[PDB]
Amino acid sequence: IRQYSYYYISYDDLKTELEDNLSKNNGQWTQELETDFLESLEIELDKVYTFCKVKHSEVFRRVKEVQEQVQHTVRLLDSNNPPTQLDFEILEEELSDIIADVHDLAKFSRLNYTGFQKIIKKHDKKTGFILKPVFQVRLDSKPFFKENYDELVVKISQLYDIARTSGAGSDGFTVLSTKSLFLGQKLQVVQADIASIDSDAVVHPTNTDFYIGGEVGNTLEKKGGKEFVEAVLELRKKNGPLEVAGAAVSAGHGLPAKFVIHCNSPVWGADKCEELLEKTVKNCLALADDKKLKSIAFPSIGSGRNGFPKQTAAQLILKAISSYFVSTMSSSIKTVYFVLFDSESIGIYVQEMAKL
């Protein structure tokens, strides 16, 4: 049966009134009929307005109750107590009730708003009495709805663009492939200048002395300028040299990135070099979590001048990233970017990501 009141539309009785009065006066209208009709309109407007005001506060009270419930369940887990079957049942019932109310309120508001506009247009046309400006004043003093079609389309189109470009936006870098890990972390292959990527952290493969002359180092220096170079130099003095598989962080001065994570990857052929490449990646991720970062961008570390075969490097890096999020309780990292420039590397990473 539902609450009947959401099915109430003022236009229905207002139309009947307008038409019954027209018919009874042979299609003629009078100031007396106009006075009565404006009274009906004002009554209907107050009815619709007060209803909307009441229902919005009701929704608000119920969502607050919902928040307390879900908060309660989080606190249970924090205290090592299990969420219960009853808790899920109650939460789902409350939510489905709220959405029913929101959905019916949305419909009720739109249809009644359209109603007032349409009954006025009909009235002014059929009667020759121009009521639109006077009723507009009433309508504006009792706001219950506004279409704002332009703003609506703008926002919906933003969501369209975000979803279509897999979250980057069409003006942003290009996302080529996305895979989600079990806990929800996104792995994305992107084509871009890694220096222009505006992730929380960018990874700079380097050596024990923080040499910045590598490919990534160079593009960071191009983008970041003197501030980047000086920041790296300061990090070298403060941190000391980078051990193999070691990582260290500097501020991303002059860079879109907030932080630069510098790592010292092992050389291909060195003792335990594959294991050390994994450790390098996890150490980068650990530092990103340490700074509470939500995103980190890797180039293909190891496969450059360190001489790792591209497929092997990709396989090891993805293995380490997967391992890390399995091991790490409540990581802040939501997205890992793989910033690649050529087709073969893109192909290799896409192939390896599918194997997970």
Domain 165-355 annotated CATH 3.40.220.10: yes
Residues annotated in the binding site, as ranges?
Answer: 193-194, 216, 265, 302-304, 306
Residue 7 DSSP code: G
Annotated binding site for a glycoprotein: 193-194, 216, 265, 302-304, 306
Side chain identity at residue 129, one-letter code: F
For every residue of 55-82, DSSP letters joined together read HHHHHHHHHHHHHHHHHHHHHHHHTT--
Instruction: Say which residues have a Cβ less than 8 Å from residue 207's Cβ, sequence separation at least 6.
Output: 242, 264
Bridge partners of residue 205, in order along the sequence: 263
Q: Give just the sign of the alpha carbon dihedral 263, 266, 271, 276.
A: positive
DSSP per-residue letters across 140-198: HHS------HHHHHHHHHHHHHHHHTTTS-TTSPEEEEEEE-TTS-EEEEEES-GGG--
Residue 308 to residues 103, 211, 305, Cα–Cα distance (Å): 57, 19, 8
Q: With contact defined as beta carbons under 8 Å apart, do 157 and 151 qualify?
A: no
